[PDB]
């Protein structure tokens, strides 16, 4: 049955709640982004109204075959009326098409649901600046002070410099990047741009990327693997066995692989700077784990919440254990006492 933290009080609405069958009293299902833990349950047989971004709606129609008549895409940064309630979609700084949702309830309560997000000071100047928020449904994925990670810009600088150096030393090296969902496209696109190559990939992955409104995409991606020296593979194939096998398939065009796994956080973060990251190597294969996150660090999350000053916080992640819940509630209280709200 649907958990309370997916239900918006005072409305007929749910958020990211497609795996529970017909939710009692739900008149409109919102979807914040196209990640499987959130869309799980949608298909061509879904016949209730789904409200989402334009990019999310392209993915629903083309990948899951949801019928057009039930997809209701909304423009960002625009006040819209849904079943008599004003809503606004805001950029979540997560993956392409990902949104946060502002609900303006009929009684005067204002609720922000962040979906999945990577908090940024740029958010302090959207439509959030303009009114008070009473309740915050918060992405608490990395809600503990051990979770530090560098900026996305520092991580992409490291990746570009590492790839450009390796291929300039050896023009017969192949670069491989792992993927299993949308998100993190900058990693493989930035590396292909520095190398003067397109990114090669499966037809299924090319189809997914063509749903994303990324400018000049026909210019950066391809299904012709033979013409590309940057290849995208499933994340599960980014290991020495999977990569050895891939290199066999390239028919002696290449004699070395440099591969990237963009993880979120890993405990090499608590000790090591980005500058200092080293690969795992076996023979002619090297694998870099790079801390490219599309979720808030602890300090980013803290700053956003101390800026917004909500009256009540409802965590949406890590809610399944009493130790996690108690930990998070203790940090929320600290933040409120330190800031004075």
16, 116, 185, 300: which one contacts Ni ion (CB under 5 A)?
116
147 or 158: CB nearest Ni ion = 147
Smallest separation, CB 206 to Ni ion (Å): 22
133 or 317: CB nearest Ni ion = 317
Query: Binding segment for Ni ion among 99-107, 116-124, 133-141, 156-164 (CB under 5 A)?
Result: 116-124
Q: How far is CA 112 from the centre of its chain?
A: 18
Query: Binding segment for Ni ion among 33-41, 234-242, 247-255, 274-282 (CB under 5 A)?
Result: 33-41
Do the Cβ atoms of 315 and 143 come closer than 8 Å?
yes
116 or 300: CB nearest Ni ion = 116
Do the Cβ atoms of 311 and 282 come closer than 8 Å?
no
Tokens of 289: 């784990």
Smallest separation, CB 16 to Ni ion (Å): 9
Q: Which 8-state DSSP code applies to residue 257?
A: E
295 binds Ni ion (CB under 5 A): no
Smallest separation, CB 79 to Ni ion (Å): 26
State the Cα–Cα distance between residues 76 and 112, nearest whole angstrom.
Answer: 15
Smallest separation, CB 91 to Ni ion (Å): 14
17, 31, 35, 189: which one contacts Ni ion (CB under 5 A)?
35
Strand ranges (E), the chain? 7-8, 13-15, 28-30, 50-53, 71-74, 80-82, 85-91, 99-104, 110-113, 135-138, 173-179, 199-200, 221-222, 230-234, 256-263, 280-282, 285-291, 312-315
Query: Binding segment for Ni ion among 16-24, 32-40, 171-179, 198-206 (CB under 5 A)?
Result: 32-40
Query: Binding segment for Ni ion among 41-49, 52-60, 65-73, 109-117 (CB under 5 A)?
Result: 109-117
**Element containing residue 301 per DSSP (H, E):** helix 298-308
Q: Which residues bind Ni ion (CB under 5 A)?
A: 35, 116
């Amino acid at each position: 049955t649907c958990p309370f933290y997916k239900k918006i009080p005072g409305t007929g609405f749910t958020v990211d709640a497609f795996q529970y069958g017909v939710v009692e009293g739900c008149t409109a299902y919102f979807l914040t982004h196209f990640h499987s833990d959130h869309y799980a349950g949608l298909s061509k047989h879904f016949t209730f109204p789904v409200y989402c971004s334009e990019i999310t709606g392209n993915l629903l129609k083309n990948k899951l075959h949801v019928q057009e008549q039930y997809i209701h895409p909304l423009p960002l940064d625009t006040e819209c009326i849904v079943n008599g309630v004003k809503v606004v979609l805001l950029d979540a700084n997560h993956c392409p098409g990902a949104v946060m949702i502002l609900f303006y309830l009929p009684n005067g309560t204002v609720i922000l649901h962040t979906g999945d997000f990577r908090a940024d000071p740029s958010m302090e100047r959207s439509l959030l600046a303009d009114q008070k928020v009473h309740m915050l449904y918060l992405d608490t994925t990395y809600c503990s002070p051990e979770y530090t990670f560098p900026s996305q810009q520092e991580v992409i600088r490291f990746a570009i410099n590492t790839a450009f150096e390796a291929v300039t030393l050896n023009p017969h090296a192949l670069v491989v990047c792992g993927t299993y969902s949308i998100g993190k496209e900058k990693v493989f696109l930035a590396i292909a741009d520095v190398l003067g190559s397109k990114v090669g990939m499966s037809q299924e992955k090319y189809k997914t990327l063509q749903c994303l409104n990324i400018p000049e995409i026909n210019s950066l991606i391809t299904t012709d693997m033979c013409s590309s020296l940057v290849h995208l593979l499933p994340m599960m194939q980014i290991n020495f066995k999977g990569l050895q096998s891939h290199l066999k398939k390239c028919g002696g065009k290449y004699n070395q692989i440099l591969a990237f796994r963009p993880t979120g956080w890993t405990h090499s973060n608590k000790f090591t700077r980005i500058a200092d990251v080293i690969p795992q190597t076996k023979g002619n294969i090297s694998i870099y784990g790079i801390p490219y996150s599309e979720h808030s660090s602890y300090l980013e999350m803290k700053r956003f919440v101390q800026w917004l000053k909500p009256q009540k916080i409802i965590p949406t992640v890590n809610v399944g254990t009493w130790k996690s819940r108690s930990t998070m509630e203790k940090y929320f209280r600290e933040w409120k006492l330190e800031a004075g709200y």
